[PDB]
Amino acid sequence: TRTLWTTPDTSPNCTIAQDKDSKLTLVLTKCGSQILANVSLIVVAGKYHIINNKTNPKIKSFTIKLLFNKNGVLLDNSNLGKAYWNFRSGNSNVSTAYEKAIGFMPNLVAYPKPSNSKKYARDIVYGTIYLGGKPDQPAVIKTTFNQETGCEYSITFNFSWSKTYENVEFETTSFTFSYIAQE
Amino acid sequence: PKYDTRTLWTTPDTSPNCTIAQDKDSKLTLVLTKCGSQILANVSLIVVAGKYHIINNKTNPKIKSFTIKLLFNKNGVLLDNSNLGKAYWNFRSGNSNVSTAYEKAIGFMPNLVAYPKPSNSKKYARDIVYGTIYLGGKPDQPAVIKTTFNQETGCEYSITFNFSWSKTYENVEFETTSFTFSYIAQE
Amino acid sequence: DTRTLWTTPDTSPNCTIAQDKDSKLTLVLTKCGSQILANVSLIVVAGKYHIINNKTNPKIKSFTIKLLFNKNGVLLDNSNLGKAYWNFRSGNSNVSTAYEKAIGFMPNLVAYPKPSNSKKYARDIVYGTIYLGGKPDQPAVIKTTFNQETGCEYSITFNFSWSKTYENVEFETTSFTFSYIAQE
Ligand SMILES: CC(=O)N[C@H]1[C@H]([C@H](O)[C@H](O)CO)O[C@@](OCCCn2cc(CN(Cc3cn(CCCO[C@]4(C(=O)O)C[C@H](O)[C@@H](NC(C)=O)[C@H]([C@H](O)[C@H](O)CO)O4)nn3)Cc3cn(CCCO[C@]4(C(=O)O)C[C@H](O)[C@@H](NC(C)=O)[C@H]([C@H](O)[C@H](O)CO)O4)nn3)nn2)(C(=O)O)C[C@@H]1O
Numbered sequence: 001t002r003t004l005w006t007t008p009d010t011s012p013n014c015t016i017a018q019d020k021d022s023k024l025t026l027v028l029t030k031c032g033s034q035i036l037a038n039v040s041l042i043v044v045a046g047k048y049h050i051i052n053n054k055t056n057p058k059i060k061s062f063t064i065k066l067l068f069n070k071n072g073v074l075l076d077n078s079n080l081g082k083a084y085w086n087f088r089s090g091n092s093n094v095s096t097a098y099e100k101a102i103g104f105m106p107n108l109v110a111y112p113k114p115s116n117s118k119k120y121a122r123d124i125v126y127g128t129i130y131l132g133g134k135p136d137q138p139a140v141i142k143t144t145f146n147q148e149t150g151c152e153y154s155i156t157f158n159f160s161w162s163k164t165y166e167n168v169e170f171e172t173t174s175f176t177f178s179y180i181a182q183e
Numbered sequence: 184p185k186y187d188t189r190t191l192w193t194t195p196d197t198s199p200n201c202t203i204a205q206d207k208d209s210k211l212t213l214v215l216t217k218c219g220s221q222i223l224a225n226v227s228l229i230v231v232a233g234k235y236h237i238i239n240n241k242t243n244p245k246i247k248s249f250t251i252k253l254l255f256n257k258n259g260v261l262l263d264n265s266n267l268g269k270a271y272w273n274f275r276s277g278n279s280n281v282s283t284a285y286e287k288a289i290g291f292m293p294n295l296v297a298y299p300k301p302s303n304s305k306k307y308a309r310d311i312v313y314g315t316i317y318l319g320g321k322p323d324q325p326a327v328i329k330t331t332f333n334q335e336t337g338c339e340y341s342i343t344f345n346f347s348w349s350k351t352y353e354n355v356e357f358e359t360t361s362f363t364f365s366y367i368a369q370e
Numbered sequence: 371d372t373r374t375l376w377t378t379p380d381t382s383p384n385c386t387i388a389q390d391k392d393s394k395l396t397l398v399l400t401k402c403g404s405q406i407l408a409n410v411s412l413i414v415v416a417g418k419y420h421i422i423n424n425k426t427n428p429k430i431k432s433f434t435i436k437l438l439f440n441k442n443g444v445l446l447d448n449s450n451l452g453k454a455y456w457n458f459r460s461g462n463s464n465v466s467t468a469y470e471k472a473i474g475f476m477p478n479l480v481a482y483p484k485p486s487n488s489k490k491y492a493r494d495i496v497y498g499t500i501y502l503g504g505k506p507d508q509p510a511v512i513k514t515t516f517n518q519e520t521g522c523e524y525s526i527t528f529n530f531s532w533s534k535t536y537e538n539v540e541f542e543t544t545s546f547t548f549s550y551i552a553q554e
Pocket residue numbers: 126127128135136137138140162313314315322323324325327349497499501506507508509511533
């Protein structure tokens with residue numbers, strides 16, 4: 001009941017450009033009013049598997065969205081597949097889909113949905129991770145809370161890079177952040 | 184009833200609660216969550232008025248940093264000469280605070296052995312945490328947030344946030360992305 | 371369960387990088403369920419890595435501090451960190467019994483496998499930057515890797531490196547926070 005996650009195996013669970021082209025490893029642990037989060041990404045096939053910006057100069061970013069309903073349940077338009085996201089049990093998931101995880105959602109007062117009122121940057125956390133664990137291959141991970149439509153809550157990960165990478169496999173080191181919880 | 188003693192915070196609203204250069208010119212959103220012997224901290228800043236609201240280093244090249252101080256007495260109570268106001272610094276209840284001002288929060292204070300006050304002893308850097316946040320959420324607008332534990336005088340404990348930047352920003356509003364860190368608690 | 375495993379927070383050397391007890395690694399691990407919240411800093415007090423001068427010694431650019439653990443999460447004697455004051459917290463010191471089990475504080479083996487024939491993924495690494503002497507123009511990279519050492523069941527390795535040409539700069543750092551997925 002304290003951790004929502006993807007399991008930490010290498011089985012693809014995520015669709016960026018094509019079905020199951022990636023394994024998003026995400027762990028959300030509820031430390032009361034904050035969620036401690038840990039994330040990494042392995043792209044296993046398709047467009048973002050091997051970066052070559054000589055061949056493809058404008059392939060410089062992509063986005064992974066987790067959309068949740070009023071119950072904190074994952075919506076199927078999410079890039080992360082529903083079968084792969086649940087409370088922890090051992091090194092696996094519970095075999096039954098969870099019904100409520102409002103306690104893990106980003107707080108809507110802290111991180112309001114888009115509206116006509118002033119939009120503040122505090123709903124974003126920036127980090128840098130490294131491709132293949134190499135220190136000279138940074139990519140930015142921008143995490144944004146509750147800015148997607150078609151949901152009550154959202155966490156989006158945008159991965160972008162400014163270097164011209166040539167035949168670099170897109171699999172990442174791990175980043176930790178936190179966010180304020182809905183309840 | 185539903186009072187959260189594991190979290191000291193400013194609330195997550197955008198109501199100004201902080202004085203940098205003039206009364207209530209900013210909202211400091213600061214959440215301290217006690218994970219036992221460590222405090223998990225989440226911080227952002229919105230400046231809404233005065234000198235640090237709109238930065239222009241073409242107009243004012245000297246305006247490059249400012250500091251926000253939280254000073255605490257022996258019981259972990261926020262002193263009135265802090266930049267943050269006492270009115271809405273308290274234990275969490277829902278998205279608001281508990282009804283009455285807290286009297287004890289020693290378990291949220293930074294550890295005085297890890298982070299000693301100034302003295303004759305050698306001063307170590309481990310009482311500082313550096314992070315970079317981004318103005319307006321734009322990746323080409325970094326500013327440095329330097330957090331320092333227990334280096335202020337006239338208090339038992341302190342947490343100070345220094346914000347600075349080295350770029351020459353032109354009409355860049357000072358409102359930041361969020362940054363998470365932790366520190367060792369006093370108990 | 372919600373406990374803290376740490377080095378104590380004094381500045382007494384507890385670590386051997388190049389010579390005996392030449393450093394104080396201050397490391398605090400706090401179990402928040404399936405994740406360990408980690409907080410780390412380093413003070414080198416003596417020896418090869420105390421005062422860096424890359425004008426006279428341009429090739430002195432990195433060093434490594436290893437914590438090796440057995441199947442019960444007990445620190446092994448050949449780790450750079452000494453066993454004497456690595457233990458569960460009591461006040462500003464430690465419990466009086468050296469711990470027997472801390473498997474719940476160990477890096478998860480499925481998330482971070484031990485070296486093998488299989489593909490080594492980068493997710494067993496965390497990168498951060500700390501600053502020498504608290505000076506904003508003195509960065510150094512702290513690279514933390516999980517479960518990549520041999521002769522143990524679990525490991526946490528800190529590699530400290532820098533790319534600036536430091537001239538007589540004392541290696542003592544600001545603090546860095548990270549987390550990792552817990553075995554249990
Ligand atoms: C694991 C790891 O850290 N890897 C890094 C590696 C690694 O260190 C080496 O590979 C190991 O050998 O290095 C990477 O970068 C090296 C690339 C080579 N390179 C070339 C240059 C030339 N510069 C011009 C220049 C700049 N400098 C010195 C800069 C001074 O910086 C410091 C300092 O004083 O030393 C760094 C400190 O960390 C700062 N302190 C603190 C507390 O933060 C300090 C203080 O701020 C000041 O001292 C106070 O005055 O400053 N020497 N020569 C070219 C150059 C241009 N720029 C600016 C544009 C690029 O940067 C930004 C931006 O827009 O401003 C920075 C933003 O943070 C970033 N945004 C995000 C969201 O991340 C943004 C975006 O990436 C882009 O806008 C695109 O969206 O870019 N800087 N330098 N210098 N270095 C490597 O690639 O190998 C980086 C790895 O991360």
